């Protein structure tokens, strides 16, 4: 055939892949964690958005730390050979590097390690997307008014390659959620995927999500500590190719 290029992930497998949504709203009383009002709005928005991108969406509500790990383990052990990609959305309380089950914390690294290139072989070389709506700390953004190492005989890739983490907020910062409308980040992500998934490469979609969250939202609080604060999401990419949700017919 003619000249061929390899700059984008193959996204025309028979299935787009799973989209697992872990929606933690209600926490055990002994954790002292508050109910996450609005998170069902996010969960529904995501289900609809990824449905229209032709993902197999599986929603899970109110999972313990043990259940989160068992779920991820089981999903990583499925045969994904006929799937283009994998998406996991985590909606919960969090701190830096940590997401909360209903009864206590899970290291994000424990969850994503199940999908490493050497541990989930049917996803090796395919994009693995983790979308994380959770705090990463307690900082508040006040805002501002505006030849040994070459040509190896056996080709390997890094086990950490082909992950993308779309974090709702910068490292160290709170993440904001409206009780009625859902989280700023998930609202914006769904809106931008609806508008641009058939038009733009994913990193460029997420850049528009960054701009929308950064410019269109500001907190309002009767507590001066928490009033008039801003948020910027944080894209963390170890992808090795461009990612388009569409393909040529």
């Amino acid at each position: 055939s003619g000249i061929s290029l390899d700059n984008s992930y193959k996204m025309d497998y028979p299935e787009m892949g799973l989209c697992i949504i872990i929606n933690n709203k209600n926490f055990h009383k002994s954790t002292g964690m508050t109910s996450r009002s609005g998170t069902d709005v996010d969960a529904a928005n995501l289900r609809e958005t990824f449905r229209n991108l032709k993902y197999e969406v599986r929603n899970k509500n109110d999972l313990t730390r043990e259940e989160i790990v068992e779920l991820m383990r089981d999903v990583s052990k499925e045969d994904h050979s006929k799937r283009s990609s994998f998406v996991c959305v985590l909606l919960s309380h969090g701190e830096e590097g940590i997401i909360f089950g209903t009864n206590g914390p899970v290291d994000l690294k424990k969850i994503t390690n199940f999908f490493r290139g050497d541990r989930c072989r049917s996803l090796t070389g395919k994009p693995k997307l983790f979308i994380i709506q959770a705090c990463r700390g307690t900082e508040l953004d006040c805002g501002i008014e505006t030849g040994v190492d070459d040509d190896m005989a056996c080709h390997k890739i890094p086990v950490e390659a082909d992950f993308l983490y779309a974090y709702s907020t910068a490292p160290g910062y709170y993440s904001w959620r409206n009780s009625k409308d859902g989280s700023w980040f998930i609202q914006s992500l769904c809106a931008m995927l609806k508008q641009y998934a058939d038009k733009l490469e994913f990193m460029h979609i997420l850049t528009r999500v960054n701009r929308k969250v950064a410019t269109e939202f500001e907190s309002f609080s009767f507590d001066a500590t928490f009033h008039a604060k801003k948020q910027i999401p944080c894209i963390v990419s170890m992808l090795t190719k461009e990612l388009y949700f569409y393909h040529q017919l």
Partner: peptide, 4 residues
């Protein structure tokens, strides 16, 4: 408005 709440934080996560």
């Amino acid at each position: 408005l709440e934080t996560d």
